[model samples]
Target: MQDKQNVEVLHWWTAGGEAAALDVLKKDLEKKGISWTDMPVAGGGGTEAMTVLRARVTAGNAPTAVQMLGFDIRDWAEQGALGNLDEIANKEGWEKVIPAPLQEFAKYDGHWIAAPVNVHSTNWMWINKAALDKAGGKEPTNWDELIALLDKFKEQGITPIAHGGQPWQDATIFDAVVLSFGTDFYKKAFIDLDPETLGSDTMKQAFDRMTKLRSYVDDNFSGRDWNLASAMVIEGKAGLQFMGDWAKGEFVKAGKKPGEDFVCMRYPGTQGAITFNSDMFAMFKVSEDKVPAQLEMASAIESPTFQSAFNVVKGSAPARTDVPDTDFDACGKKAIADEKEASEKGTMLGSMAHGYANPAAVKNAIYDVVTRQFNGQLSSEDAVKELVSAVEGAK
Candidate 1:
């Protein structure tokens, strides 16, 4: 291994708490004599950084490591820009340790290409327990029930839902809604990009529900970032936040407990299917000495030590299922248990193909449509039309 192989991580975790979580990786890598270069992007999911990624790759000088998403991994692998990590993965017995759904994203052509870091589920509804208590202390079982509960909270002078009108955040919420509504329909519309599903009664109903939900939303929702929405729920300004477990980072930063400070649950109808994404790093084609550094980083990433420490603080579940949830907070423990149960029951689905079209293209399209849909100009019919056209048009 080189004396000091630097890993340049390209990612969107630039918020204060997110930056703090990334520091865990930095400090850990530094202790091992690996230099960590922080190339943080502030937008949702590193839209800006991706542009830089495209430019770098085009210039034939990609970084040694990239903060890769499952879908993006697919795109780059298709371009033959990513290194095959199957040797390291097999040597380290990663298949035995990592969850199968995540394994799907880490590979291309049956060869490992990226190292998955954390399993982040997108089907969550986070609520302030105190706000729920204020509105009668009962968690609603379904969307209708949640709406009624939110109405009650609104009447009592609280914002029913805290939401940032960003595309990914909006798309994340839409995915949860469709999950509760119908996973099959969700897969068709979002994953397969089926025109029928996009134009179906279910899609209309989901949009209608979002319309009603808009009435209870706080002012300044549009153009706001996800972390701010999380803060709203944390401070009891909003009764609920339909987001992924990553929102837990805000709570972790605030030093809040799960059961006492907040509550996390599947969005009413998520049933058993686990829709999850990951924050992983892909080793770009590099030198032999850099290979050892990449392998070491991958080893540290999947270790029980780093998995427990990093995921515990980041508000995500560990990629390795062998780890116990004893160290996880109440909400995290619940998430880990649910994820395990779903994995055993065969209800877990790698979310890579579903929500966004592919990786970069699909995400940008969904973001544009979702943000526009929330703007009131695009009607349900128009949205359905645009969704089908835009999704099909994505790479």
Candidate 2:
């Protein structure tokens, strides 16, 4: 029966643009004689999904594929809960195209353990062109100018920053603010997890920026989903949002044109330096009959055809180098061009907020402090102190 060829996909991509992007991949599988069974866990941007995934894997009822982020792919691999794709990877010549940073998580102990579909950069600011024009502002090139622009936006009776108060969303902006101090400090504090760096006066500066940023958001932002924040900017209710290219799908899906209607810019001071993450499909260990479908799904994800079709909709650049820009819009083209330049300049660092740099242990610790500090609970100085203690304790 066709039911035997079904691939159950577990993910948290339940929003407007996010869902449409997945449907592209779903249709691809359908043509290959495999049915796409939806198993979405909404909220927390895969935080809730991961919790459910833990139970499924423990119960020996793991889905055929799970949408995974950076280190989480490796975590599942380390548990021996994931299926291998060495044969398909070799057949597809994945080595010739995958970026090194993405390849790091896609493989485990020299075995191909996950299918990396696209690369996403976190240091992005999505601006509504009409809102910016009305507010009497242009694209800001640095932090001070950005604050001025936010003030201008505030004057126009628009929410200066469309935001969600979720921990990961807060941490997404947190990483951008931290990266603004420049990559050296970002590397030392986040990638290296240096206690001195974590507790430094410079770290306090990062906290201060977040505290100031907190004032620009509207009061009703708590518990808002990320895409709703994107919608706020898309509808011109807000000036801009600090989000990854994933937010682009919402604009495109709403029939808005890039460049004219909206624009994607690097998060000011973080330009030319990319804090990156890849969205990968981590196939799980399955029974003998499901192996063929599982391999088919992995191969499809790595295909140039699927890469173009899916990433075009997903608002990310292709994971492979050979995919062309024939279908990509303005923002998508910029992401591809920026990715290549950043790769050459050796400035593509793993995004700690997105789970590429630190393991869950350390990432969660940083998240707790970031969220607490983003609220009124912690001062910049005390947050830095707690951050050091948290990192130390997490280890």
Candidate 3:
């Protein structure tokens, strides 16, 4: 029999909203007489935490579980270093409850290795209503209208977009810009990795819009964290932010009410599609005496009650398809509804910035070109050429 009293977790959820979300799981585990040992690494995208996890695994001391996303879970599982949670998953019917995109990483070689926690979509645009009213009081219905709004904000002496100059932040917007070209172009260029599309007029159009957006940001955005950018919108210092639904948690944490205080919408022209990353907890293979604790924690993570409660605070949609939006607030309700519609329309896709669409190598290569283009180090034409070269080099 395995001990169930103590469980250790390794994760990067050190921010206010994210940490509060973690507490939901902690408190729930407490009900079962379990205590948590939190090892938090502070990096918005879990980049630093993954590095730390690698070192721990190399030293043969992996934590009880690691909060992971996308390929990271699959990569660890393929190394045969992850614990098997097939027992609990089978009993709970996770295969049917969990969305298919999430199941792609949660399972490895036909066995469940990770339990999905929440679904975060990256194609959202968070806008401040106050700023919108100043910029003519109209929500953008297309890319051209979005640009016009940005210009209007600039004319009113408002920062048009709250964006961090970090590579990941740049890639987040770039992903939406690619999707603005429609699903076929997005899939062909990003998912299929077709050289022709990567170098085509479509790819150049994405870079062109990306470059134009550069003029709307403030000068002090370099190296700023994503949450701080979200703050820009929440406080109405800026007009908009192109970010994942996780950004909604920042607004919620500030005690701001959605729809009244802010507006959430799909990036114009990208409404039907959702670029998503599912946050998951991958259980590491622990000693026989501690296996029960890992399984227990994983079970709590996937429970309907926990999923609904946790995601409400986390500002993400629940990963389980069966969970209702009843307890969620305005933002959460919209996310759940949007996710459902996109799923039925077959327009849900993996996010490249958060590591769901491709491996780190490929993602990093694209990030390099995107940041370069955004920073004026490369022109749109050069970016198109470099994108193809970067992907081929990674391959």
Candidate 4:
């Protein structure tokens, strides 16, 4: 019984900023009279952590609370490997505060099985202030202006876009281009998996936009990690990067002040909208004795205090909307405002690249086509044809 008190917390928060945020939760659980058994898997993308989790669960030794995201939580819940949190979730009135779209991933089949820690919206474009100053006296409000700015940066002999040519990173840009089409179109093509929309001219135009962004990338982008890509903007080696809120953590880690050193904006046309992915804690199905510890953790996970505290360091905004921006910097404040504005405007969306819009099968299928096209393996028209077929095949 005492052993269960040391709840094993498995996560992939081994980096500088990420580890700092996890430390807060570690101490929080400790102060609450529960001990932490750390099982950190070090991979920025979290695929390695999932690999480790698979082995642990298969061997009947799953951790007490595992950090999960999006559909990964739902998938584990479907296997009955996750603990049910209906009681705590109901008592806390999560439905009253959490957005309906975000709720779909946390609550599975009418039962809550995970605790959402933060909303990591992926539509942000981070720019170095000095780099932007060199380019021109303005930031873009649309795609054409973005291209003009990129061209200016190029003429100045600076890397216009700091990017990692990984499939996931490619999908980040691809999905942003898709969202730029419109919220309804993005949802129809990604969430509803509408074959007509996926094969439509709009989808082809999204690919065209991807090609335009690809032209601005530095030659060394291939095989680069996301953080290194972010470093380009942080060190002013590049003008900007289109990344999730997590990129803000890199800036924070470098001790750079938002607005002074860097600026965070939506991807041009994506203003008044947000595409978000949440990080959550999916409690595993432990013995009855460990249930108390699970509830204790969940209780804190849902609190406004903890939400604000955790998200401030984790490079995301509070999952609950009521949390104020008192603790946030300019970027943090903007993140909260973006979610609120998008939610109000009915444009707060789940990101397809970040596992919010679909399962891994459909997501990877799209990733394959996007990456191939960005690397010059296929034309935008061929890419659209492949996109439709691949999603159909995956579905």
Off-target runs (Cα >4 Å) in candidate 3 are: 1-4
- Model 2, TM vs. native: 0.98
Model 1 earns a TM-score of 0.93
**C-alpha displacement of 364 in model 3, angstroms?**
0.9
Where is model 1 poorest over a 10-residue stretch in terms of lDDT?
A: 349-358
Number of the top-ranking candidate, with lDDT as the measure: 2
Model 4, 149-213: lDDT tens digits are 88988987889999998888888887788888889999999989999999999998998888889
- Tens digits of per-residue lDDT, candidate 3, 1-395, equal 44349888889888788888888999999988888898998888888899998899899899998989888888888899898999999999998888887888999998999989999999999999888887778999898899999998888787899999999999999889998899888888777888999999989989999989998899999999999999999988899999999998889889888878899999999987899989898888879878988899889998999999999999999999999999999889989998888888878888889998888888889999999999999999999999999998887
Clashes of 1: 0
TM per prediction: 0.93, 0.98, 0.97, 0.95
Give the runs in model 4 whose Cα sits over 4 Å from its true position.
Answer: 1-4
Give all candidates' CA lDDT scores. 0.78, 0.91, 0.90, 0.88
Off by over 4 Å in 2: 1-4
lDDT of 3 at 132: 87
What TM-score number comes out for model 3? 0.97
Q: Over the stretch 203-238, how does candidate 1's per-residue lDDT look in tens digits?
A: 878777667777778887988888888998999888
